[PDB]
Coordinates of C-alpha atoms and ligand atoms in Angstrom, one line a residue:
Chain A
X1 CA 158.8 75.2 109.0
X2 CA 155.3 76.2 107.9
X3 CA 153.5 75.7 104.6
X4 CA 151.5 78.4 103.0
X5 CA 149.9 79.1 99.7
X6 CA 152.7 81.3 98.3
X7 CA 152.7 83.4 95.2
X8 CA 155.8 84.5 93.3
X9 CA 157.0 88.0 94.1
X10 CA 154.9 90.3 91.9
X11 CA 157.3 93.2 91.4
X12 CA 158.4 92.4 87.8
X13 CA 154.7 92.1 86.8
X14 CA 153.6 95.3 88.7
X15 CA 156.0 97.4 86.5
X16 CA 153.9 96.1 83.4
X17 CA 150.4 97.0 84.5
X18 CA 148.7 99.8 82.7
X19 CA 145.0 100.9 82.3
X20 CA 143.3 100.5 78.9
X21 CA 140.1 102.5 78.2
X22 CA 138.1 102.2 75.0
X23 CA 134.9 104.3 75.1
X24 CA 133.2 103.4 78.4
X25 CA 135.1 100.1 79.1
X26 CA 138.2 100.3 81.4
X27 CA 140.3 97.2 82.1
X28 CA 144.0 96.3 82.6
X29 CA 146.7 95.9 80.0
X30 CA 150.1 94.3 80.1
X31 CA 152.9 96.7 78.8
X32 CA 155.9 94.7 77.6
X33 CA 158.4 96.5 75.3
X34 CA 156.3 98.7 72.9
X35 CA 153.2 96.6 73.1
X36 CA 150.2 96.6 75.5
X37 CA 148.3 93.3 75.7
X38 CA 144.7 93.3 76.9
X39 CA 141.4 91.3 76.4
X40 CA 139.9 92.1 73.0
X41 CA 136.4 92.6 74.6
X42 CA 137.6 96.1 75.7
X43 CA 136.2 97.3 72.2
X44 CA 132.7 95.9 73.0
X45 CA 129.5 97.6 74.4
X46 CA 126.2 95.9 75.8
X47 CA 125.0 95.4 72.1
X48 CA 128.4 94.1 71.0
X49 CA 129.0 91.5 73.8
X50 CA 125.8 89.6 72.9
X51 CA 127.3 88.4 69.5
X52 CA 130.5 90.4 68.8
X53 CA 132.3 90.5 65.4
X54 CA 135.7 91.6 66.7
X55 CA 137.5 92.1 63.3
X56 CA 134.6 94.4 62.3
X57 CA 134.5 96.3 65.6
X58 CA 138.4 96.7 65.6
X59 CA 138.4 98.0 62.0
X60 CA 136.1 100.9 63.2
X61 CA 138.7 101.8 65.9
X62 CA 141.6 104.3 65.5
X63 CA 144.7 104.4 67.6
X64 CA 143.5 107.5 69.4
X65 CA 140.3 105.6 70.6
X66 CA 142.5 103.6 73.0
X67 CA 143.5 105.6 76.0
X68 CA 146.4 103.8 77.7
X69 CA 147.7 105.0 81.0
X70 CA 150.9 103.9 82.7
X71 CA 150.7 105.5 86.2
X72 CA 149.8 109.1 85.6
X73 CA 151.4 109.1 82.1
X74 CA 149.3 108.8 79.0
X75 CA 150.9 106.4 76.4
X76 CA 150.2 107.0 72.8
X77 CA 149.0 104.1 70.8
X78 CA 150.6 104.0 67.3
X79 CA 149.1 100.7 66.1
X80 CA 146.6 98.0 67.0
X81 CA 146.2 94.3 66.0
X82 CA 144.3 91.3 67.3
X83 CA 145.8 87.9 68.1
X84 CA 143.0 85.4 69.0
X85 CA 141.1 86.9 72.0
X86 CA 143.9 89.4 72.9
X87 CA 144.4 93.0 71.6
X88 CA 147.9 94.2 71.0
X89 CA 148.2 98.0 71.2
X90 CA 151.5 99.2 69.8
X91 CA 152.7 102.2 71.8
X92 CA 155.5 104.7 71.1
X93 CA 157.3 104.0 74.3
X94 CA 159.1 100.8 75.3
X95 CA 158.4 100.0 79.0
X96 CA 161.6 100.7 80.8
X97 CA 160.5 98.2 83.5
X98 CA 160.2 95.4 81.0
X99 CA 161.5 92.2 82.6
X100 CA 163.0 89.2 81.0
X101 CA 159.8 87.3 79.9
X102 CA 158.2 84.5 77.9
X103 CA 154.6 83.7 76.9
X104 CA 153.9 80.1 78.0
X105 CA 150.6 78.1 77.7
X106 CA 150.2 76.0 80.9
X107 CA 148.6 72.6 81.4
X108 CA 145.7 71.8 83.9
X109 CA 147.2 71.2 87.4
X110 CA 149.9 73.8 86.9
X111 CA 149.9 76.6 89.3
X112 CA 150.6 80.3 88.8
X113 CA 150.4 83.6 90.7
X114 CA 147.8 86.2 89.7
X115 CA 148.3 89.9 90.0
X116 CA 144.8 91.2 90.4
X117 CA 144.5 94.8 89.1
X118 CA 141.9 97.5 88.9
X119 CA 142.4 100.5 86.6
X120 CA 146.0 99.4 85.8
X121 CA 146.9 99.3 89.5
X122 CA 147.8 96.1 91.3
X123 CA 145.5 95.4 94.3
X124 CA 146.5 91.8 95.2
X125 CA 148.4 88.7 94.4
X126 CA 147.4 85.1 95.0
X127 CA 148.4 81.6 94.0
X128 CA 146.0 79.5 92.1
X129 CA 145.9 76.5 89.8
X130 CA 144.6 75.9 86.3
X131 CA 141.7 73.5 87.1
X132 CA 141.4 70.3 85.1
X133 CA 138.1 71.8 83.7
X134 CA 140.3 74.8 82.6
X135 CA 138.7 77.4 84.9
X136 CA 140.6 79.1 87.7
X137 CA 139.1 79.7 91.1
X138 CA 140.2 83.2 91.4
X139 CA 138.9 86.3 93.1
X140 CA 138.0 89.0 90.6
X141 CA 135.6 91.9 90.6
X142 CA 134.4 94.0 87.6
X143 CA 137.4 95.8 86.1
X144 CA 139.8 93.0 86.8
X145 CA 139.9 91.9 83.2
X146 CA 143.4 92.0 81.8
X147 CA 144.9 90.9 85.2
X148 CA 147.7 88.4 84.5
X149 CA 148.8 85.0 85.8
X150 CA 152.5 84.2 85.8
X151 CA 155.4 82.1 87.1
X152 CA 159.0 83.1 87.6
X153 CA 161.9 80.8 86.8
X154 CA 165.3 82.3 87.6
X155 CA 165.0 86.0 86.6
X156 CA 162.4 85.3 83.8
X157 CA 158.6 85.9 84.0
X158 CA 156.6 83.3 82.2
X159 CA 153.2 84.9 81.5
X160 CA 150.6 82.2 81.3
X161 CA 147.2 83.8 81.9
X162 CA 145.1 86.9 81.2
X163 CA 141.7 87.2 82.8
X164 CA 138.7 87.7 80.5
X165 CA 135.5 86.6 82.3
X166 CA 133.6 85.1 85.3
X167 CA 131.3 82.1 84.8
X168 CA 127.9 81.7 86.6
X169 CA 129.4 79.5 89.4
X170 CA 131.9 82.3 90.3
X171 CA 134.8 80.6 88.7
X172 CA 137.0 82.4 86.1
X173 CA 138.0 81.9 82.5
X174 CA 140.7 83.5 80.6
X175 CA 143.5 83.0 77.9
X176 CA 147.2 82.5 77.5
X177 CA 149.1 85.7 76.3
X178 CA 148.6 84.6 72.7
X179 CA 144.8 85.0 73.2
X180 CA 143.9 81.3 73.2
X181 CA 141.4 80.6 75.8
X182 CA 142.0 77.9 78.4
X183 CA 138.9 75.7 78.2
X184 CA 135.9 75.5 75.9
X185 CA 135.0 79.1 76.5
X186 CA 134.4 82.0 74.2
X187 CA 134.5 85.8 75.0
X188 CA 130.8 86.6 74.5
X189 CA 127.8 87.1 76.8
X190 CA 126.2 83.8 76.2
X191 CA 125.3 80.6 78.1
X192 CA 128.7 79.0 79.3
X193 CA 129.3 76.6 82.0
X194 CA 132.4 75.2 83.6
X195 CA 132.5 71.4 83.2
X196 CA 132.5 69.1 86.3
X197 CA 135.8 69.6 88.0
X198 CA 138.3 66.9 89.2
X199 CA 141.0 66.9 91.9
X200 CA 144.5 67.4 90.8
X201 CA 146.0 64.1 92.1
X202 CA 149.8 64.8 91.5
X203 CA 149.4 68.1 93.4
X204 CA 147.5 66.4 96.3
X205 CA 150.4 63.9 96.6
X206 CA 153.0 66.8 96.5
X207 CA 151.1 68.5 99.3
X208 CA 151.0 65.2 101.3
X209 CA 154.8 65.2 100.9
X210 CA 155.0 68.8 102.1
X211 CA 152.9 67.7 105.2
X212 CA 155.5 64.9 105.9
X213 CA 158.4 67.4 105.5
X214 CA 156.6 69.6 108.1
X215 CA 156.1 66.6 110.5
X216 CA 152.5 65.6 109.8
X217 CA 152.6 61.8 109.3
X218 CA 149.3 60.5 110.9
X219 CA 148.1 59.6 107.4
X220 CA 151.0 57.5 106.4
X221 CA 150.6 53.7 106.3
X222 CA 152.5 50.5 105.7
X223 CA 150.7 50.0 102.4
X224 CA 151.6 50.4 98.8
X225 CA 149.6 50.1 95.5
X226 CA 150.0 49.5 91.9
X227 CA 149.6 52.7 89.6
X228 CA 146.6 50.9 87.9
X229 CA 144.8 50.2 91.2
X230 CA 145.4 53.6 92.4
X231 CA 143.9 55.1 89.1
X232 CA 140.8 52.9 89.5
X233 CA 140.2 54.4 93.0
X234 CA 141.1 57.9 91.6
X235 CA 138.5 57.7 88.8
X236 CA 135.8 56.7 91.4
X237 CA 136.4 59.9 93.5
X238 CA 136.7 62.4 90.6
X239 CA 140.4 62.5 90.9
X240 CA 142.7 63.0 87.8
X241 CA 144.6 60.0 86.6
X242 CA 148.1 59.7 87.9
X243 CA 150.5 59.1 85.1
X244 CA 154.1 57.6 85.2
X245 CA 155.3 61.3 84.4
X246 CA 153.6 62.4 87.8
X247 CA 155.4 59.6 89.7
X248 CA 158.8 60.6 88.2
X249 CA 158.1 64.3 88.9
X250 CA 157.3 63.3 92.5
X251 CA 160.7 61.4 92.7
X252 CA 162.8 64.0 94.5
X253 CA 160.1 64.3 97.3
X254 CA 159.8 60.6 97.5
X255 CA 163.6 60.4 98.0
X256 CA 163.6 63.3 100.6
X257 CA 160.9 61.8 102.7
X258 CA 161.6 58.1 102.2
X259 CA 158.0 57.4 101.1
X260 CA 157.6 55.9 97.6
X261 CA 155.1 57.6 95.4
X262 CA 153.0 54.4 95.3
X263 CA 153.3 54.3 99.1
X264 CA 151.9 57.9 99.3
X265 CA 149.2 56.8 96.8
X266 CA 148.0 54.1 99.3
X267 CA 147.8 56.8 102.0
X268 CA 145.7 58.9 99.5
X269 CA 143.5 55.9 98.7
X270 CA 142.7 55.5 102.4
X271 CA 142.1 59.2 102.9
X272 CA 139.5 59.1 100.1
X273 CA 137.7 55.9 101.2
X274 CA 137.8 56.7 104.9
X275 CA 138.3 60.5 105.3
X276 CA 140.3 62.6 107.8
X277 CA 138.4 61.5 111.0
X278 CA 138.4 64.9 112.5
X279 CA 142.2 65.3 111.8
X280 CA 143.8 68.0 109.6
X281 CA 146.8 68.0 107.3
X282 CA 148.8 71.3 107.2
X283 CA 145.9 73.0 109.0
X284 CA 143.4 71.9 106.3
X285 CA 140.5 69.4 106.6
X286 CA 140.4 68.8 102.8
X287 CA 143.1 67.5 100.5
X288 CA 144.7 70.6 98.9
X289 CA 145.5 70.3 95.2
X290 CA 146.9 73.7 94.3
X291 CA 150.6 73.0 95.1
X292 CA 152.5 71.3 92.4
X293 CA 155.5 69.0 93.2
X294 CA 157.8 71.9 92.0
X295 CA 156.0 74.4 94.3
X296 CA 156.5 72.0 97.3
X297 CA 160.3 71.6 96.5
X298 CA 160.6 75.4 96.0
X299 CA 158.9 76.3 99.3
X300 CA 160.5 73.6 101.3
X301 CA 164.1 74.3 100.0
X302 CA 163.8 78.2 99.7
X303 CA 164.4 79.0 96.0
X304 CA 164.7 82.9 95.4
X305 CA 163.8 85.4 92.6
Chain B
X1 CA 133.0 86.8 92.8
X2 CA 135.4 84.2 94.4
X3 CA 137.3 84.4 97.7
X4 CA 140.9 83.8 98.0
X5 CA 143.7 84.3 100.5
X6 CA 145.1 87.4 98.9
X7 CA 148.4 89.0 99.7
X8 CA 149.3 92.6 98.8
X9 CA 151.5 93.0 95.6
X10 CA 155.1 92.7 96.9
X11 CA 156.9 95.0 94.4
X12 CA 157.3 98.0 96.7
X13 CA 158.9 95.7 99.5
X14 CA 161.1 93.7 97.0
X15 CA 162.9 97.0 96.1
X16 CA 163.9 97.3 99.8
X17 CA 165.3 93.7 100.4
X18 CA 169.1 93.5 100.9
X19 CA 171.4 90.9 102.4
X20 CA 173.1 91.6 105.8
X21 CA 176.2 89.7 106.7
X22 CA 178.0 90.0 110.1
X23 CA 180.7 87.5 110.4
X24 CA 179.2 84.1 109.6
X25 CA 175.6 85.1 110.0
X26 CA 173.7 86.1 106.9
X27 CA 170.1 87.3 107.0
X28 CA 167.8 89.9 105.3
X29 CA 167.6 93.6 105.8
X30 CA 165.0 96.3 104.9
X31 CA 166.6 99.2 103.1
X32 CA 164.5 102.4 103.5
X33 CA 166.1 105.8 102.7
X34 CA 169.7 105.5 104.0
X35 CA 168.9 103.0 106.8
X36 CA 169.0 99.2 106.7
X37 CA 166.8 97.5 109.4
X38 CA 167.5 94.0 110.4
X39 CA 167.1 91.6 113.5
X40 CA 169.8 92.5 116.0
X41 CA 170.8 88.7 116.4
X42 CA 172.8 89.1 113.2
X43 CA 175.7 90.2 115.6
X44 CA 175.4 86.9 117.6
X45 CA 177.8 84.0 117.6
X46 CA 177.4 80.3 118.8
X47 CA 178.4 81.2 122.4
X48 CA 176.2 84.4 122.4
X49 CA 172.7 82.9 121.6
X50 CA 171.5 81.7 125.0
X51 CA 172.2 85.0 126.9
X52 CA 173.4 87.7 124.4
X53 CA 174.3 91.1 125.8
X54 CA 173.5 93.0 122.6
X55 CA 174.8 96.4 123.8
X56 CA 178.2 94.9 124.6
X57 CA 178.4 92.9 121.3
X58 CA 177.4 95.9 119.2
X59 CA 179.9 98.2 120.9
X60 CA 182.7 95.7 119.7
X61 CA 181.4 96.1 116.1
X62 CA 182.7 98.6 113.6
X63 CA 180.8 99.8 110.5
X64 CA 183.1 97.7 108.3
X65 CA 182.1 94.5 110.0
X66 CA 178.6 94.7 108.5
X67 CA 178.5 93.6 104.9
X68 CA 175.3 94.9 103.2
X69 CA 174.5 93.8 99.7
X70 CA 171.7 95.3 97.5
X71 CA 171.6 93.2 94.4
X72 CA 175.2 92.9 93.2
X73 CA 176.2 96.2 94.8
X74 CA 177.9 96.4 98.2
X75 CA 176.5 99.2 100.3
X76 CA 178.9 101.0 102.7
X77 CA 177.7 101.1 106.3
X78 CA 178.6 104.5 107.7
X79 CA 176.8 104.1 111.1
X80 CA 175.0 101.6 113.4
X81 CA 172.5 101.8 116.2
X82 CA 170.2 99.5 118.0
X83 CA 166.5 100.2 118.7
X84 CA 165.0 97.4 120.9
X85 CA 165.6 94.1 119.0
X86 CA 166.3 95.7 115.6
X87 CA 169.6 96.9 114.3
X88 CA 169.7 100.1 112.2
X89 CA 172.7 100.2 109.8
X90 CA 173.1 103.7 108.4
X91 CA 174.4 103.4 104.8
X92 CA 175.9 106.0 102.3
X93 CA 173.2 105.5 99.7
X94 CA 169.5 106.3 100.0
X95 CA 167.4 103.5 98.3
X96 CA 166.1 105.0 95.1
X97 CA 163.3 102.4 95.2
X98 CA 162.1 103.6 98.7
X99 CA 158.3 103.7 98.6
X100 CA 156.0 105.9 100.8
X101 CA 156.0 104.0 104.0
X102 CA 155.1 103.9 107.8
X103 CA 156.0 101.6 110.7
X104 CA 152.8 100.4 112.3
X105 CA 152.5 98.0 115.3
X106 CA 149.5 95.6 114.7
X107 CA 147.0 93.9 117.1
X108 CA 146.3 90.1 117.3
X109 CA 143.8 89.2 114.6
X110 CA 145.3 91.7 112.1
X111 CA 146.5 90.3 108.8
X112 CA 149.5 91.2 106.6
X113 CA 151.5 90.0 103.7
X114 CA 154.9 88.4 104.2
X115 CA 157.7 88.7 101.7
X116 CA 159.9 85.7 102.4
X117 CA 163.5 86.3 101.5
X118 CA 166.8 84.3 101.5
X119 CA 170.1 86.2 101.1
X120 CA 168.3 89.5 100.4
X121 CA 166.3 87.9 97.6
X122 CA 162.5 87.5 97.6
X123 CA 161.5 83.9 97.2
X124 CA 157.7 84.2 97.8
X125 CA 154.8 86.2 99.1
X126 CA 152.0 84.9 101.3
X127 CA 149.3 86.2 103.7
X128 CA 148.9 85.5 107.4
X129 CA 147.5 86.9 110.6
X130 CA 149.1 87.9 114.0
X131 CA 147.7 85.0 116.1
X132 CA 146.0 85.8 119.5
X133 CA 149.1 84.2 121.1
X134 CA 151.3 86.8 119.2
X135 CA 153.0 84.2 117.0
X136 CA 152.5 84.0 113.2
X137 CA 152.0 80.7 111.3
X138 CA 154.5 81.6 108.6
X139 CA 156.5 79.6 106.1
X140 CA 160.1 80.3 107.0
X141 CA 163.4 78.4 106.7
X142 CA 166.9 79.2 108.1
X143 CA 168.1 82.5 106.6
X144 CA 164.5 84.0 106.4
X145 CA 165.3 86.3 109.4
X146 CA 164.7 89.9 108.4
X147 CA 161.8 89.0 106.0
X148 CA 159.0 91.6 106.5
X149 CA 155.3 91.6 107.0
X150 CA 153.4 94.6 105.6
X151 CA 150.1 96.0 104.3
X152 CA 149.5 98.6 101.5
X153 CA 147.1 101.6 101.7
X154 CA 146.9 103.2 98.3
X155 CA 150.6 103.9 97.4
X156 CA 151.9 103.5 101.1
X157 CA 153.5 100.5 102.7
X158 CA 152.8 99.9 106.4
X159 CA 155.6 97.7 107.7
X160 CA 154.3 95.8 110.7
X161 CA 156.5 92.8 111.1
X162 CA 160.1 91.7 110.8
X163 CA 160.8 88.0 111.3
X164 CA 163.2 87.0 114.1
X165 CA 162.7 83.4 115.3
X166 CA 161.0 80.0 115.0
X167 CA 159.5 78.5 118.1
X168 CA 159.6 74.7 118.8
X169 CA 156.1 74.2 117.4
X170 CA 157.1 75.7 114.0
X171 CA 155.3 78.9 114.6
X172 CA 157.2 82.2 114.2
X173 CA 158.0 85.2 116.4
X174 CA 159.1 88.6 115.4
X175 CA 158.9 92.3 116.0
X176 CA 157.4 95.5 114.7
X177 CA 159.9 97.8 112.7
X178 CA 160.7 99.6 116.0
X179 CA 162.2 96.2 117.3
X180 CA 159.5 95.6 119.9
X181 CA 158.6 91.9 119.9
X182 CA 155.0 90.8 119.4
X183 CA 154.3 88.5 122.4
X184 CA 156.3 87.5 125.4
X185 CA 159.3 86.5 123.3
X186 CA 163.0 87.4 123.6
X187 CA 165.6 87.2 120.9
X188 CA 167.5 84.4 122.8
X189 CA 167.8 80.6 122.4
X190 CA 166.4 80.3 125.9
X191 CA 163.4 77.9 126.3
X192 CA 160.3 79.7 124.9
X193 CA 156.9 78.5 124.2
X194 CA 153.9 79.9 122.2
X195 CA 150.9 80.1 124.5
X196 CA 147.8 78.0 123.6
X197 CA 146.4 79.6 120.4
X198 CA 142.7 80.6 120.0
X199 CA 140.6 81.2 116.9
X200 CA 140.1 84.8 115.8
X201 CA 136.3 85.0 116.2
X202 CA 135.8 88.4 114.6
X203 CA 137.7 87.2 111.5
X204 CA 135.7 84.0 111.3
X205 CA 132.4 86.1 111.4
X206 CA 133.9 88.4 108.6
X207 CA 134.7 85.3 106.5
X208 CA 131.1 84.0 107.1
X209 CA 129.8 87.4 105.7
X210 CA 132.2 87.0 102.8
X211 CA 130.6 83.5 102.1
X212 CA 127.1 85.0 102.2
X213 CA 128.2 87.8 99.8
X214 CA 129.5 85.0 97.5
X215 CA 126.2 83.0 97.7
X216 CA 127.0 80.4 100.4
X217 CA 124.1 80.4 102.9
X218 CA 123.6 76.8 104.0
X219 CA 125.1 77.6 107.5
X220 CA 122.6 80.5 108.2
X221 CA 119.9 80.0 110.8
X222 CA 116.7 81.6 112.2
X223 CA 118.5 82.2 115.6
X224 CA 120.1 85.2 117.3
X225 CA 122.1 85.3 120.5
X226 CA 123.2 87.7 123.3
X227 CA 126.9 88.7 123.1
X228 CA 127.4 87.1 126.5
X229 CA 125.8 83.7 125.5
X230 CA 127.9 83.8 122.3
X231 CA 131.1 84.3 124.3
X232 CA 130.3 81.5 126.8
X233 CA 130.0 79.0 123.9
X234 CA 132.8 80.4 121.8
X235 CA 135.4 80.1 124.7
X236 CA 134.6 76.4 124.9
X237 CA 135.9 75.9 121.4
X238 CA 139.0 78.1 122.2
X239 CA 137.6 81.0 120.4
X240 CA 138.6 84.6 121.2
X241 CA 136.0 86.6 123.0
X242 CA 133.9 88.8 120.7
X243 CA 133.9 92.3 122.1
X244 CA 131.5 95.1 121.3
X245 CA 134.3 96.7 119.2
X246 CA 134.2 93.6 117.0
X247 CA 130.4 93.8 116.7
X248 CA 130.7 97.4 115.6
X249 CA 133.4 96.5 113.1
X250 CA 131.1 93.9 111.6
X251 CA 128.4 96.6 111.1
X252 CA 129.0 97.3 107.3
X253 CA 129.0 93.6 106.4
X254 CA 125.9 93.1 108.6
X255 CA 124.2 96.0 106.7
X256 CA 125.4 94.7 103.3
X257 CA 124.1 91.1 103.8
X258 CA 121.0 92.0 106.0
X259 CA 122.3 89.5 108.7
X260 CA 122.7 91.1 112.2
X261 CA 126.0 90.3 113.9
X262 CA 124.3 88.4 116.7
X263 CA 122.3 86.6 114.0
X264 CA 125.6 85.5 112.4
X265 CA 127.0 84.7 115.9
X266 CA 124.2 82.2 116.3
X267 CA 125.1 80.7 112.9
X268 CA 128.7 80.4 114.2
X269 CA 127.5 78.7 117.3
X270 CA 125.6 76.1 115.3
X271 CA 128.7 75.5 113.1
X272 CA 130.8 74.9 116.2
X273 CA 128.3 72.4 117.6
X274 CA 127.7 70.5 114.4
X275 CA 130.7 70.8 112.3
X276 CA 130.3 71.1 108.5
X277 CA 128.7 67.7 107.8
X278 CA 130.7 67.2 104.6
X279 CA 129.9 70.7 103.4
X280 CA 132.4 73.5 102.8
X281 CA 132.3 77.2 103.1
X282 CA 134.2 79.2 100.5
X283 CA 136.1 76.0 99.4
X284 CA 137.2 75.4 103.0
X285 CA 136.1 72.5 105.3
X286 CA 137.4 74.6 108.4
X287 CA 136.3 78.0 109.7
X288 CA 138.9 80.4 108.3
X289 CA 140.2 83.1 110.7
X290 CA 142.9 84.9 108.7
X291 CA 140.6 87.4 106.9
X292 CA 139.7 90.6 108.9
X293 CA 136.5 92.5 108.4
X294 CA 138.6 95.1 106.5
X295 CA 140.1 92.3 104.2
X296 CA 136.5 91.0 103.4
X297 CA 135.2 94.5 102.5
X298 CA 138.3 95.2 100.4
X299 CA 138.2 91.9 98.4
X300 CA 134.4 91.9 98.0
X301 CA 134.0 95.5 96.8
Ligands
LIG1 C1 132.1 91.1 86.2 C2 133.4 90.4 86.1 C3 133.9 89.8 87.3 C4 135.1 89.1 87.3 N1 135.8 88.9 86.1 C5 135.3 89.5 85.0 C6 134.1 90.2 85.0 N2 133.5 90.6 83.8 C7 132.9 89.8 82.9 O1 132.8 88.6 83.0 C8 132.4 90.6 81.6 C9 131.0 91.1 82.0 C10 129.9 90.0 81.9 O2 129.9 89.4 80.6 C11 131.0 89.0 80.1 C12 131.1 88.0 79.1 C13 132.2 87.6 78.5 C14 133.4 88.2 78.8 CL1 134.8 87.8 77.9 C15 133.4 89.2 79.8 C16 132.3 89.6 80.5
LIG2 C1 166.1 78.6 111.8 C2 164.9 79.5 111.6 C3 163.9 79.1 110.8 C4 162.7 80.0 110.6 N1 162.7 81.2 111.2 C5 163.7 81.6 112.0 C6 164.9 80.8 112.2 N2 165.9 81.2 113.1 C7 165.8 81.1 114.5 O1 164.8 80.8 115.1 C8 167.1 81.5 115.2 C9 168.1 80.3 115.4 C10 167.5 79.5 116.5 O2 167.3 80.2 117.8 C11 166.9 81.5 117.7 C12 166.7 82.1 118.9 C13 166.3 83.5 118.9 C14 166.3 84.1 117.7 CL1 165.8 85.8 117.8 C15 166.5 83.6 116.5 C16 166.9 82.2 116.5
LIG3 CL1 160.7 68.1 91.6

């Protein structure tokens, strides 16, 4: 029993975190094989970040300008290239701790673990979701740039996020490991705002199933709804549309609990129109949307890595 | 900016998780140097769960009865001893991944990270606090026994918890790494109940300071209170008494935000009386009590 926000074990990613210093800027890098990946804004100053021409700034850099440190060992950069908003620093040494890995771009609603680092040293790990507005509600201080988001399937790390910046609302923006930003963001000190956020409907339903598995059933009701009627109500409450794919993904949980997806949807509909009435679900007075259906299955059936 | 429930990176603990099998029971063990630590109930059978005599059951065991597996490598147990409710299986190989570590016994209100494991394999990492009733509100299934709770200071792991049992309410009971149980619990299937839980007041105040540091101030008020008047109100909402030690511990956050501890206490009193009125603090509609003052300072600075 019990349901908690649970991150993937961070050990495989901890063995990849290095410190990257370029002039006065120090941030984190991800050392995989003989390449260190880090945000390209490490080459920028106060003047540069206002309107940076990254190709021009990088052409002025030499390999010895990049100080890369893996623990107390200096790595020697033997090459440098840029792929979108990420800088790839070729090093002479392949990381002996390189795990089996892939670079994956995730969809909004998908969750991942973040290994927050400062000076190439992991300080914390947390589970968060890629918001529908493509921001993440992380916890990052200055120096956390280059910290990565990931998932683990079997013995393989899927790197899905690299932290680049913090928006005025305190939410965070970053890229996949190919340097493509999630959201309509750019890596420049300029006016940028996170769009209005929406609730991740499929994840709320998955968390309601987790609550039923844990014995919380007060919210269940005799009613069911059509997918269309539910989506009408969802649009009204700034909730993401629930697609047929989401219903099929929720299938195993629906079978395990004996509560059809459209039956759980009618519970969610009542929770939105009426509220919790002083009651909580899984110790929360709000509807949690940062547990996907796979996260619920994984935690409720104990899958290991 | 941002505030999240943050667990320590689990890598240093992952390299210590092994599987311990004794007969039909399989749980997790913590391999540090040449010793594997695990709950002593791994030596119990169906008939030996209500009233186990562990000294007698362990005397009947030999080193070869304990099967220890570190990855796909069987470790050879060369000795066994019991320290309170933990079993210490001396092995013929020092763990090369042994980090700098200490065994620490924590107080209620203290937080730690839990590396949940099944069959000596880490499945997830989460954060939680030692409740005032000495239980933990973990996420644990059958086979999770031996999973550990820890904190990390610089490069050193302070092991503070080893999971042992689930109480009827779904809350969890375990011991420090010296086998001493937290709470009035025993490693027996005898009827055991977690006492009524209370909210960790000092942690709620630390989290209100975290909210102020992050720009959330709607809950602040022009009032202050005496420590006694705050405690008379708090107790009515099943909140832990706030001691002078807690007031001293909240000093740095009080200085950083410019809001005196007794001033924040009056804001807490108002929140308890009014509820949140559809508002949230740090994305939560409830008062969070699983962030210590030390956690807030650490995460915010
Ligand atoms: C200070 C901080 C906190 C958390 N995460 C990240 C940061 N850092 C930033 O955001 C920096 C400094 C500010 O200006 C910008 C603008 C664009 C980009 Cl890509 C980076 C940055
Ligand atoms: C099944 C499970 C789930 C989560 N965490 C733990 C468990 N396991 C238990 O509680 C087991 C089996 C049941 O009874 C007792 C009694 C005493 C002790 Cl020390 C252990 C246990
Ligand atoms: Cl599924």
